[PDB]
Design a protein around this nucleic acid. Structure first.
Ligand SMILES: [Zn+2]
Length: 834
DNA sequence: GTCAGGATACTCCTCAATCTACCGGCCGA
DNA sequence: TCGGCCGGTAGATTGAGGAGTATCCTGAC
């Protein structure tokens, strides 16, 4: 023992005398009893009595009925106390091997709580009653009973479950959720008393009240919500959803009161928007984070050079105040000694338990970098995760054995550990790699792929359990099982497949390959359940073939896409004139729900005001990331530079940009003829009045640029300069000059669909040659802004599109430098052949 | 001796967006 | 042999947000 241990036992004076006298036989009856466990047991309210009970009982308690090891006994004595140990001794054979049928783990979980003897006797006397009359799962009863004051929770559940289920319409799962917390009797009683008042007077959804009251001290949160809903909604302009999001956390009453007190201070003296404040306060212990922000925002923003956004990001997590003080204390030493940039420190500190991650990084960066050969970036990657302290310690402990005995490489171990719960995945790999690679015929790279994702331990265990079942009974392949399991929540996907594969392949006429394809993404359980529920509805009520539904579902958010298609098929098919194929194509992408909703919102605006044919909007949305693309296009079009609108509308495709040189009548007539030819090619009539108006605007404004979109409307750009834009490395701009002097704008991309076979399709020279062929132009000259010169393919395939006898002169920019063996930096003429 | 409220820290799942490697029919110099 | 200022397909990161589990603490009887 050390002086710190004696200080620890100083809380219980009788334990200090007991330990110093009977230490010889405590370790004798309890092998592998460390000093920390002893000081933890002895410093409780009954430390001496608990140690005496452990000495007396642990010798025989390890029998067949319980077979509890020394760790379980120490945990019971530390948490339950001497009374819990005595109760367990008195009821060794009553709890297990009886109609109760409780495994030793459940008994240990129930007993190792404050006042756990009462919980043990109460679960003993109510388990048959709760299981028979009220139809409660024994696991649920054990979950309710394993809480501080769990006897009161059990009694209140027995008294009030029928009332809550009948007179208030709550499922038994919800009541079990409410009553599985400390002081659950108070939460149940307050829910029963205040459910109507909150649901009708304050307009609260019953599930919202349940979410509020399913936390520790939920009675206080409910009463505080009732008290402070009008104040925060009216005097501070907070939507009720924000208030119920604040209050749905442990200590939500304190968070609500602190918000009500400090919102004006944090909003009129620190420059924080209310959204930032309610994001800070929407986490466990949000009052502490709010107060620490109010105290340390100037210090961390003026001396340590952190933006307020970084401070809000650090403080928007569980234990945010601990992270804020740790950042203040450790930023100079983590930056001026260990070499981390402040962004990396902020990234490490921006997760739950960020204080532990930062302290562990400061402690273990040199040893992990030197003894194990890890890069600092790898250590930061491991640490920038929830529970990163545990992952770093596990990496330090298990890198040699995993790299040497199991044949893994450090990169594989780091990849496994760089995830939430990476310690569990590492331990599970180190335990299960031989049996998986020997009995089930897997390979180490497959095991690493399975274990890399979050919940890799659960996926590994589920694979080790279900691979023979799925491969023999259901006729799958080990590769298909590995593909299903190599995703986030792969255990749920594996179980859902093992349940629904015969049903899906028999009732709905699907294919095992189709099921494996749907199940091989994140939320594959959700996608499988949605497919099983909605395949008939989509097939008859909307006329969608099963292949289309499988194509929609085989995406990361497939459930959301399927529900969005169900909701939005008729309105988009009728109110917007979209074929079902277009909606299916839009939704058959990651984030297809967002694309569908964005199309719903922004189809009329782009179609009527701007000049976008529905085909262009569908094509933009039919790609991945459809919402950001549509939003960016709308933002550029509604308010942006004239040039930027020019490139956006050119890249949309199908547009013709024409600029005149002189106000002579002949050039105006030629431009009108070209516009008419393009419009007839697009199949839209320009009408005489619009032709007269555009001729007037062309003859009255010199240097104006006209843009004819496929929709029909003509955009006018009066000032977009007389020179080619500087090359941006992504898009090339070209100007075609004819004999008279008119200039035609071209942009790389959007090639001719019937010439996809050509490797020069979509290039500026190819587009110019196609334009010359379509408009019957004898000769022309192209100026492009690309500094890499003409493409290699366009050097030989250009004189294949333009008609024979036509001369096209390509002129690269003066400062062009060829980057390839086939590019050209000099002016070149092209004459076509047959 | 038991109970309640709060407080952190860690683990597993679902969804969205972006990035990257890949292929492919058609040409003369 | 050797050249894509293109576009589709498929996979592989990146990031966020939301739940669920777990241990601890103080104050009050
Ligand atoms: Zn080219």
């Amino acid at each position: 023992f050390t002086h710190a241990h004696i200080v620890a036992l100083s809380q219980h004076p009788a334990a200090l005398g007991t330990v110093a006298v009977k230490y010889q036989d405590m370790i004798a009856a309890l092998p592998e009893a460390t000093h920390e466990a002893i000081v933890g047991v002895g410093k409780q309210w009954s430390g001496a009595r608990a140690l005496e009970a452990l000495l007396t009982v642990a010798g025989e308690l390890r029998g067949p009925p319980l077979q509890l090891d020394t760790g379980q006994l120490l945990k019971i004595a530390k948490r339950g106390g001497v009374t819990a140990v005595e109760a367990v001794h008195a009821w060794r054979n009553a709890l297990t091997g009886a109609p109760l049928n409780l495994t030793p783990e459940q008994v240990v979980a129930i007993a190792s709580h404050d006042g756990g003897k009462q919980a043990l006797e109460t679960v003993q006397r109510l388990l048959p009653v709760l299981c028979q009359a009220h139809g409660l799962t024994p696991e649920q009863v054990v979950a309710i009973a394993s809480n501080i004051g769990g006897k009161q929770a059990l009694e209140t559940v027995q008294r009030l479950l029928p009332v809550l289920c009948q007179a208030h319409g709550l499922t038994p799962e919800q009541v079990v959720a409410i009553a599985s917390n400390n002081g659950g009797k108070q939460a149940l009683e307050t829910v029963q008393r205040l459910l109507p008042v909150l649901c009708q007077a304050h307009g609260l959804t019953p599930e919202q009240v349940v979410a509020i009251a399913s936390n520790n001290g939920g009675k206080q949160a409910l009463e505080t919500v009732q008290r402070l809903l009008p104040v925060l909604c009216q005097a501070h302009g907070l939507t009720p959803e924000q208030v119920v999001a604040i209050a749905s956390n442990i200590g939500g009453k304190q968070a609500l009161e602190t918000v009500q007190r400090l919102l004006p201070v944090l909003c009129q003296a620190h420059g924080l928007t209310p959204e930032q404040v309610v994001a800070i306060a929407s986490n466990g212990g949000g009052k502490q984070a709010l107060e620490t922000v109010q105290r340390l925002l100037p210090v961390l923003c003026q001396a340590h050079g952190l933006t307020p956004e970084q401070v809000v990001a650090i403080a928007s997590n569980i234990g945010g105040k601990q992270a804020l003080e740790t950042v203040q204390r450790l930023l100079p030493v983590l930056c001026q000694a260990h070499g981390l940039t402040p962004e990396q420190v902020v990234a490490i500190a921006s997760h739950d338990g960020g204080k532990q991650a930062l302290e562990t990084v400061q402690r273990l960066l040199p040893v992990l970098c030197q003894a194990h050969g890890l890069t600092p970036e790898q250590v930061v990657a491991i640490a920038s995760n929830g529970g990163g302290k545990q992952a770093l310690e596990t990496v330090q402990r298990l890198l040699p054995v995993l790299c040497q005995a199991h044949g893994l490489t450090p990169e594989q171990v780091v990849a496994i550990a760089s995830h939430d719960g990476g310690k569990q995945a590492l331990e599970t790999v180190q335990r299960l790699l031989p049996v998986l690679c020997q009995a089930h015929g897997l390979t180490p790279e497959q095991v690493v792929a399975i274990a890399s994702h979050d919940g890799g331990k659960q996926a590994l265990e589920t694979v080790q359990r279900l691979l023979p079942v799925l491969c023999q009974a259901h006729g799958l392949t080990p590769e298909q099982v590995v593909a299903i399991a190599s995703n986030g929540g792969g255990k749920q996907a594996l179980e859902t497949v093992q349940r629904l594969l015969p049903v899906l392949c028999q009732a709905h006429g699907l294919t095992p390959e189709q099921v494996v394809a749907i199940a091989s993404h994140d939320g594959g359980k959700q996608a499988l359940e949605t497919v099983q529920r909605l395949l008939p509805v989509l097939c008859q009520a909307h006329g969608l073939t099963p292949e289309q539904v499988v194509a929609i579902a085989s995406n990361i958010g497939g459930k959301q896409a399927l529900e969005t298609v169900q909701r939005l098929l008729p309105v988009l098919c009728q109110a917007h004139g979209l074929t079902p194929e277009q909606v299916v194509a839009i939704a058959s992408n990651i984030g297809g729900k967002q694309a569908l909703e964005t199309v719903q919102r922004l189809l009329p605006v782009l179609c009527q005001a701007h000049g976008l044919t529905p085909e262009q909007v569908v094509a933009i949305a039919s790609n991945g990331g459809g919402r950001p693309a549509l939003e960016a296009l709308h933002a550029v079009l509604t308010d942006g530079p004239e040039e930027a609108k020019y490139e956006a509308l050119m890249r949309l495709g199908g547009a013709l940009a024409i600029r005149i040189s002189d106000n002579s009548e002949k050039q105006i007539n030629t431009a009108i003829n070209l516009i008419k030819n393009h419009a007839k090619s697009k199949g839209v009539e320009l009408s005489e009045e619009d032709i007269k108006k555009v001729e007037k605007i062309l003859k009255e404004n010199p240097g104006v640029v006209l843009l004819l979109t496929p929709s029909g409307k003509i955009h006018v750009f009066p000032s977009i300069s007389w020179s080619l834009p500087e090359y941006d490395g992504t898009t090339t701009h070209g100007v075609l000059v004819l004999d008279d002097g008119t200039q035609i704008g071209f942009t790389s991309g959007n090639g001719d669909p019937r010439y996809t076979n050509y490797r020069n399709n979509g290039h500026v020279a190819q587009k110019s040659a196609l334009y010359m062929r379509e408009n019957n132009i004898s000769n022309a000259t192209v100026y492009h802004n690309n500094t890499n010169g003409t493409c290699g393919y366009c050097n030989t395939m250009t004189a294949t599109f333009l008609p024979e006898g036509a001369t096209l002169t390509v002129v690269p920019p003066e400062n062009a430098v060829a980057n390839n063996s086939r590019a050209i930096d000099y002016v070149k003429t092209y004459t076509g052949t047959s």
